[PDB]
Amino acid sequence: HHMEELLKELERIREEAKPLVEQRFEEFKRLGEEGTEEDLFCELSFCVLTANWSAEGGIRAQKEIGKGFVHLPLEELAEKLREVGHRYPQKRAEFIVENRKLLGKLKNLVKGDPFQSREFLVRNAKGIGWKEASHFLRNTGVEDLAILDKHVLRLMKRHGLIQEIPKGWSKKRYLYVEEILRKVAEAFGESPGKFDLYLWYLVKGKVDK
Template sequence: MIPPKEEIEKAISEVKKYVDQRIKEFKNLKSKNLTTFNFRPFLDIEPYQADIFSEACFCILTANSSAAMGIKIQKSIGIKGFKNLDLKDLYEKIREHGHRFAMQRAERIVKLREKENFLLDIAKEKDGKKAREKLVKEIYGYGYKEASHFLRNIGFDDVAIIDRHISRFLFEKGLVKPRKTITKKVYLECEEALEKIAKDFKLTQAELDLYIFYIKTKKVLK
């Protein structure tokens, strides 16, 4: 087994420019409520614009699915579509891409429209962990992972996204005891382990997440 230090160093040497680019795209969302995502060479998809609300919708779409599918749907629906399409049309747009939970996701996105101003206010927060608690309490269907994903994607550096790729990396490297279920306690334990790694490499949590995702998938997505 390759030690985590060697794998992360190798990932940094291979894709640092793409990780830096993605972080800049995220920071634009936080400061301007608008960014242009460019996922080439990892996905053959034209660059497209997103705002904070459409990014919250992306995080709904990618849960129990994949980042690649969420990206394709986000580009297809667009900023205005997430805010204005009726439930039926939104469902059809999501279903076209083969999403297993198209109607449930469409319903959640329509419901999320009530919280657009709340999401914009959250983007102004300074502390990602405090913002996460507010999101989990306020946004229907958002757990720690979805809330952390959204915050990272809108420019917060201090929360970790404990998805299957990240948890598997930690378990395989013996950094955290393997668990079948990611409870809140396990989530925070994993996040603490990642904080130590990030500190060792002088990386933010946001950067480290992208590097580990690349190690597991050979892609820098979001």
Template sequence: MTGCARSAEQGRRNLKRLRNEELLRELQFLRNSEISEVIRKRIEEFIELGNREEKEIFKELCFCILTANFRADRCIEIQRRIDDGFLNLSFEELRDELRKLGHRYPERRAEFIVEARKHIGVLKGLLEMEEREAREWLVRNIRGVGYKEASHFLRNVGKMNVAIIDKHIMSILSEFFGIEKPRSMTRRRYLEMENILRGIAEEVGLSLGELDLYLWFMKTGKVLK
């Protein structure tokens, strides 16, 4: 490596370190702000949901299936409107309801949700498993659920040791660490990014689930779910 190349590499490392420190400072600021109480209450809601009956937990799984390539705030409204329909509507009825409510993929999401009903009885037991093991089960066994959706579901029912790597979190990783969005999110790539986020979480004393809420607030100004 030439002297110029070494200098450039050192410059990149220094910039990355400074950007990391900037992110940590911003997170610490938010932890000491009023938004921390909003996030604390949201986490309490997640934990409470995880202690409810399996039908309620399943409806949260349906919400997470809906969020793939679609806006979370729209999915929250759809979940509120359909409610028990996730449990008992036929495929055609659910598809038509999703279409009426403006979901981008009504047919595929209805198909995934109706098929996933056969797993309602295992959800409580799933939450007794270690988070990453539970995530692997979800990805293997439920169509329409990838690592992001499985992590999202687990976090929303109180399992806080997984990362939800969506476009907002990818934007943070790109902005502060120069990580480009992969063309396809393989398991290996997802876990690599999750490990970066785990390191950040440890630096500021947060779980991955908490960190996601803070990062999401940084990008959107909202605390959703």
């Protein structure tokens, strides 16, 4: 399959998807602009939980646990994650509890240079790698970054943009594949952060987060 085929299909869904994409982005921008440290922490926790899980699951976990991500002890947090169906509740709970060290630092991170903020989160936030750090930043309104998850990587491979799907990341390799996708986003006329939502609309016609 060729790149033009992908762009044409995206153009066919663009008009219908746009209101959903724009409304979802307004919510992301609201979080970055008006969100408290705890609000940002809950979004970081959403990204920990959806590393290898559906947006639907993470949204349900966020709804059910809420500020529990901030205050619950490890055992109680793990139990609530087990209750909402997470497959790895103990380890994700441990990541979230450890990440509480970042409360007080998130507002500045979200406002900082997004490439530098992503580097920080990769190194310092548990359960957050290159993809999940990009995801968190995008979900606070950042538009500069791609979220290279399995769905996006498979689309890129199917349309000849990359030759193989990476099963792990480094700074240089993530930046490289991200730049490939940035050029596609630019060809379409959208920022990487919004382009991601158009790409995901292709699957089932949904715009989650």
